[PDB]
Amino acid sequence: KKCTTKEDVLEAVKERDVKFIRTQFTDTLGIIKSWAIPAEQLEEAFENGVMFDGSSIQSDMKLALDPSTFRILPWRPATGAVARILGDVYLPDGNPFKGDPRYVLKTAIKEAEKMGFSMNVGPELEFFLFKLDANGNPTTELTDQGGYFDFAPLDRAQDVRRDIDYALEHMGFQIEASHHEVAPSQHEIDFRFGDVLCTADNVVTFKYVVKSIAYHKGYYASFMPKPLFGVNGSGMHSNQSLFKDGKNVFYDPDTPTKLSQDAMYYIGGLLKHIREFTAVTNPVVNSYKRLVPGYEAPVYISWSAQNRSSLIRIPATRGNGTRIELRCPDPACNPYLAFALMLRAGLEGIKNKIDPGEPTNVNIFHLSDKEREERGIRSLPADLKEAIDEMKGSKFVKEALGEHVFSHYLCAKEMEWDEYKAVVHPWELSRYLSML
């Protein structure tokens, strides 16, 4: 069932014999942070909250648990049941901490509600399933050579996949559909189209649930945006819709395309502002190894209805199911920041009535540079450094994320890029050692 009050949580813990409670939160960079609490401490934690270190996020912070987020993890140790819970971070003086990505998403939700809109997001997460070495360390050994939508694997990896699906279903995730992806040993899982906050929490839970199941079954699940060269990467498309007064606002039966003017303004705002938070949507270096021409990943800023290579795709579904799909993000991104920025950009586009321009129904990759210049088609940042440079001068991103998160994210990404740029890769040795 659904737990609402802390009394319900206590009753569930006593009834099902939950021995340990794990908090759950994410830092600025998207890493999942957690710590364990004994079951007896739960009542005191509900009464007064738990003190902890804010340096894990960014220095003493108080966490106030949220009973509505209580859920039981889908494994049963012989000791007892295990459950997780979320909450809000407060400063010692009582003010909420503005460095929490969840707080950023909540502020974005409040800004949206100020105009009466609410967002529902259904993401599509893709991941790989590799083998483990003799020492249990992760590797890149493939498990099958299947293709798109193939009925594979059929060995024990099939049992592992079925176990993952059943574990996800056991928590009430309400999975839409799961299938093989284009690359070998690549799988995709579609989430139910639902509220944005619950969706972000479900994604965060999903990542480590899948990783733990993969370990316990003897395999490895990876979320790298591009773990292998020559095959498709892993992306996280974000279907979204806005609802006012319980009705979808993107649907307009009186228009030839069955789309309202608000949807046009939303698309225009997203197209205008996507360059600035491309760094947020693609937070690691590998993400830009994924974003290269010649695959399903989009590298040009355009929107279309029938075309699939466009950055923003509008599915043929209409009515209450009308949605807009953004194909840039990858699973390595922080869901809270990405969703908050996407919502804020869409709202700014709607408010300012930004025209999205004509759609691109042709294959952009087949066009020439002169054609792209004539049509005025821009491209996403080529590497992480360019994305950081674009983000630095963006006042909109700074306003949306706040000073603290903006500065910390920029510093961390800058240090990571500086560390990366000075390495000598074996490819350079292979190409240059004998030639020079």
Q: Was 40 annotated as part of a binding site?
A: no
CB 202 within 8 A of CB 283: no
Consult the annotation and say whether 327 binds a ligand.
yes
Catalytic residue, from 27, 100, 124, 348: name it.
124
Catalytic residue among 7, 43, 53, 159: 53
Q: Which two tokens stand for residue 390?
A: 């674009």
> Residue 43 or residue 53: which is nearer to a second copy going by CB?
53
Residue of 308, 373, 374, 399 marked active site: 308
56 vs 394, which CB is nearer to a second copy? 56
Residue 188 marked ligand-binding: yes
Contact (Cβ atoms closer than 8 angstroms) between residue 302 and residue 312: yes
The residue among 155 and 374 lying less far from a second copy, judged by its C-beta, is 155
Known active-site residue 416 = no
CA distances from 18 to 63, 71, 85, 431 (A): 21, 11, 12, 58
Contacts of 230 (CB under 8 A, 6+ apart): none
Answer yes or no: is 99 a known binding residue.
no
Q: Known catalytic residue: 308?
A: yes
From 8, 165, 325, 390, the catalytic residue: 325
* Shortest distance, position 393 Cβ to a second copy, whole Å: 29
Cα distance between residue 69 and residue 65, in whole Å: 9
| H-only helix segments in 217-321 | 261-281, 286-290
Binding site for a second copy (CB under 8 A): 19-20, 22, 24, 31-38, 40-41, 50-53, 55-56, 59-60, 77, 79-80, 82, 92, 136, 147-151, 154-156, 158-159, 162-163, 165-166, 169, 174-180, 208, 211-212, 215-216, 306, 308, 315-317
For residue 67, the number of C-alpha atoms closer than 13 Å in the C-beta half-sphere is: 17
With CA atoms as reference, report the closest residue to 221 among 207, 237, 235, 202: 207
Full DSSP string of 373-402: HHHT--B--SSHHHHHHHHHT-HHHHHHH-
CB of 56 to a second copy, least distance (A): 4
126 is catalytic: yes
The residue among 154, 168, 162 whose CA lies nearest residue 125 is 168
Q: Is 84 annotated in some ligand binding site?
A: no
- 325 carries an active-site annotation: yes
Is 181 annotated in a binding site? The answer is yes
Binding residues for L-glutamate: 232-233, 290, 296, 308, 327
Binding residues for Mg(2+): 124, 126, 181, 188, 237, 325
Catalytic machinery residues: 53, 124, 126, 181, 188, 237, 308, 325, 327
